[PDB]
Symmetry: C5
Subunit: 308 residues, 5 copies
């Protein structure tokens, strides 16, 4: 008894990912098909009804169900819409849409994070004994030039009709609380190039160069230099944080920078220890030289151990 609705979603563009709000933008078309009481049309050719006229057809009692994007954020921008009314009953609703969609997004493995962009589609008023999603086709384009793009869409889209039971309701009438829901997934990974060459690498070099504090001859030389290195790291945290996506947690990159702060606070604790370890506050030429490429080892070891 429920109406069978066949859905097709064409996806043109996924862009404008907002990390903090955990949202992304989607431009595409949506197509919905169902069959009803047949109709006498001009000619026996199908009838086309564009935009403002659909309202009039609905006002004279044409059945056009809602279909709401569950995970949209604010009313999406709908472009031109179309009704194609067939004489043998059918009907097809075709409309373009631009919307901001929500999903959980874990950006902790940044800049090597994998995300999946999702659309969820569900009738607004009609349960599965009134309206049912029969099948979902999903269409995406084949991106020829990938570096142009920030994200690489890795796979064809996964689709799945399913059924949603709403437990807190108006009247239960025990079979009127389940809804048909299309769910669409598109997996993707971040193009990690720019973030490697322009942030990760320089932070490496600078962190390396921090260790060369030890190869200064004087103690005064070594300790005063640490303060300039300290500053370089502050400047660097400022650089990354101002240009990298804002988040509520530490990334790979954020960790490197805290490491940088420590390697420098560490050396300062040693550089100053050397100068008082032995009696006669003689600078301690034995301990330092070892640190010179022990640190580049010890940091390169206990720093090599995060896979969280």
């Amino acid at each position: 008894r429920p109406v069978d609705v066949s859905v097709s979603i064409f996806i043109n563009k996924i862009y404008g990912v907002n990390t903090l709000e955990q949202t992304y933008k989607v431009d595409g078309y949506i197509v919905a098909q169902w069959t009803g009481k047949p109709r006498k049309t001009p000619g026996d050719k199908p009838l086309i009804v564009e935009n403002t006229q659909i309202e009039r057809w609905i006002n004279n009692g044409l059945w056009v169900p809602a279909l709401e994007f569950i995970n949209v954020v604010g009313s999406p921008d709908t472009g031109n819409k179309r009704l194609m009314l067939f004489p043998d009953g059918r009907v097809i609703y075709n409309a373009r849409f631009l919307g901001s969609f929500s999903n959980d997004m874990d950006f902790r493995l940044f800049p090597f994070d994998r995300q999946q962009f999702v659309l969820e589609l569900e009738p607004f008023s009609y349960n599965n004994q009134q309206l049912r999603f029969s099948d979902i086709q999903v269409y995406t384009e084949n991106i020829d030039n990938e570096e142009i793009d920030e994200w690489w869409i890795r796979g064809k889209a996964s689709t799945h009709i399913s059924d949603i039971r709403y437990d807190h309701l108006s009247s239960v009438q025990p079979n009127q609380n389940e809804f048909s829901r299309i769910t669409v997934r598109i997996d993707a990974v971040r193009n990690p190039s720019y973030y490697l060459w322009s942030f990760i690498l320089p932070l490496g070099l600078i962190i390396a160069a921090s260790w060369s504090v030890f190869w200064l001859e004087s103690f005064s030389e070594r300790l005063q230099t640490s303060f300039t290195l300290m500053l370089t790291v502050v400047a660097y945290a400022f650089y990354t944080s101002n240009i990298l996506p804002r988040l509520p947690y530490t990334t790979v990159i954020d960790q490197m920078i805290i490491a940088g702060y420590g390697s420098i606070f560490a050396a300062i604790l040693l550089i100053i220890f050397a100068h008082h370890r032995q009696a006669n506050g003689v600078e301690d030429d034995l301990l330092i030289q070892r640190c010179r490429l022990a640190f580049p080892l010890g940091f390169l070891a206990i720093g090599c151990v995060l896979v969280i």
Copy 2:
């Protein structure tokens, strides 16, 4: 004989906290139920009226009352609208909404502050002798993925029907100036992760290592380093302020920064005092070693007394 209206608010998303405007974004549905004169429907099955058609029904004199979000800021984004008209008299209005809401918000304990997100719902035109909130249900989803999220939602929602007396009204007759008001509350706390490891921690280290000025042997060495340290805290002041939420008052982190400014202006008053102290204006290297761990203590103590 006031009309009893039963309200249910499903809440999907709280996001977009604006610290300075003291606002937040809320996505959800709102449901309102009431009973009126019974009705002739197609079949004896209830009638559904979606979006554009509700307006037409209102035009034939269907009572669909206002209901205003008292604390919304600007007309909220309304998604789909639905009326369910039952034959047995009653009526259910179901709508999706995205709005920017206002509440008082104290950000002084940042990044360890707790807040409560609030909705206030009240009829726009009809008082409690005409329209009364019978009961308010509020539903939230439960959160497994919490680190992902910026805020931590504590407990399920507090609800509140009450009556508001408006003293300034034209045809007052003071038994017609009281309005029925739902009020919903959601407590939440800030996820202090990012702010601890990436701001609080390094600022300690920087303030710490600032103290290591005293272990420089020369005076020229100590004073010249002090100006570089000064610069570093400024660089840090810029770093935090550019990334932390703007507020009209100082947070914890801002005070740490003023502290760093103090510890360093302090040492400069000493580092230069030593250079003249007792008789024979001696290069009194004696104060400095006291200082080496005198006001890493004197600071970590006189700073230990912030309890606002």
Copy 3:
């Protein structure tokens, strides 16, 4: 013959002050009452007419005058509208509004500036001989938690009905050119808290500590150090401008910084004067030392004459 219109303006929130545009955001309700030809209502109870239906009443020639916010910037966001039609002739228009309003704003005494938020309300089409503002009430909230707020509202609201002469006319009889105008004022001052503790104070310390250049023994030490001080004032100027409101003129803080640039450029001229003033390249260790409290005096004085 002129219509008497009684206005009440409830003010909920004054926020979002934009310095450069000289504007601010105002959320509130507006109420207008005027009385006309008596009327048949259902019962002898008043008729309430919400939102979309007002249009219908206006089409059948219900007189609802304009009322324009003279000093708004763009058509305001209007929430719900309401007509209360009384049987005994009278009529009340009640609507919620959010708007961006313009007034003159002098930010020179920042962050110790005083401003006044203003609404100006005027009939759009009907002059003072057709439509007249009889009286104006303005209602505001009681601000209990004052630091929470960026601005402190100091006073209850000032109101003023008046008459405006428009110099240009296309209707004959030159006495059809004056309009009734409600005018409302609200004075307020900026919470100078954040700005003293996070900018002014360190700017003192930073400016002060620049003077400790003179307590350096060498000339090499003194001149090379001043270049580092220079960099600090620059980095600090960068800090302020990025975080302070952007403007087209100098505030105090902007000036302190320029002085700061001078305090350092001067010092550089002495440090270099001393070192070549006297004969036989004898150092003029007297100028330095005379300076030790000439500058901390001459500057903490020559800045005291910013009494504008």
Copy 4:
């Protein structure tokens, strides 16, 4: 045969200049008068028709021509609309508008440049043989206190009706092209204070103080300091670039900053030259002796010759 249309444009506010789009915001009223079919009005008094009602008269076939702002950017925000319909034929359209307008803008002499704010107005559908602009008045406020304002208006507004020939139009249909176009101009100059005192001045001082490197006695002193001076200019370029309006070409300031870079790269080339010119690798303190006031001239000379 054509209708004569008399226009008046009241200008309230010119604000919100966007340099890169080369646009600006204009708030004002527009008034159009023309005479048509005489009419049966209530009374022999003119009839006022506001907002929603104007559309209705147009549906009964009232001629209300378009009028388009040629140089606007996107549909302007139109506030209240008014028709004053006189019985003696004539017709007045009065509307408030806020719009973003585009004009060519040359910012090379920034911050000492003059600009002219412009409106261009032309009917959307009707040529000059159907609709003709008879005459154009423009009304602007006098402006009380000028620095409050970012821009200073140098002149009363220029007006100019003209006729524009469109070469590719309708059919061929010769001689029914050409459109009546009002054009309004307002010249203005930038309030150049802020940019002198907070940018030009300190950059001079920074550049000046750079020259005092030559007065360092050692070579090590002079060369190592230059790298600090370098850093200062980078820091300064960043201060300016982040805070000044963005453009696609170099301004005055942008050039001064390139100068600062060269003046230092030059100095690095000299400072290191002296140190190798003479025999027995003696420092060539004779050259650096000369430079101390060669640069303040040589820079202020071949750098003075900026007259672009």
Copy 5:
């Protein structure tokens, strides 16, 4: 049988390129002509129908086809709409539009890149057997070699009408799946002036002067100074990236900056290598000296290689 539609697109302004979204803004008019049912108009003079009225005519069964900008992002801002209805059947739709358009954009050769601005137009509902694009005229402004302008256009617009075969939908004899599509291209090149003089040039000077590290006398001098140069490169990356367009890949300039990090990290690996190679812990000043303008070749040569 299909209707021939002749399109003319006037382009006023291409602006607001968004690098990250790969979009650009286009302001212009669009005109479409086709011939239909002959018609009785007032006089035998053609009839004009503006804005709101078009909707009326469409309701009495006037055919005004969709026409969608295929590569637009969101419903574009449509200004005034116009129908010109001719007595001999034909019909012209003239409308103004401001829209945000999408194309693939490769910014890797920035700031020396060439891009092509694109419009794509296609009927929304009607295939090529119903509606056919006869021809596309494009009109653009002629202004030439212009600095006010950010871009240099390389030619008048190139166009291409075609037929697009859609693999998916309910087809009659499958030739009802092809659509007529206008396509417009405008090539343009980035004017690299600003970017050479204000970024490339100083980055050169800075990289150069980094080499004068080798010409420092001491080893302490050489190693301590390079840490300052490092800082400078860091300060510069922050400068460039904060003001240059955001992208997901490295540009020319980005590479130059990575080079600077290398030029300095290399030097540090050397400055410290020289100082330990030989027996008799001898200073190794030949190898240094050789490096002094070995780098300036070594860099200015193999960096002079890139041809991507």
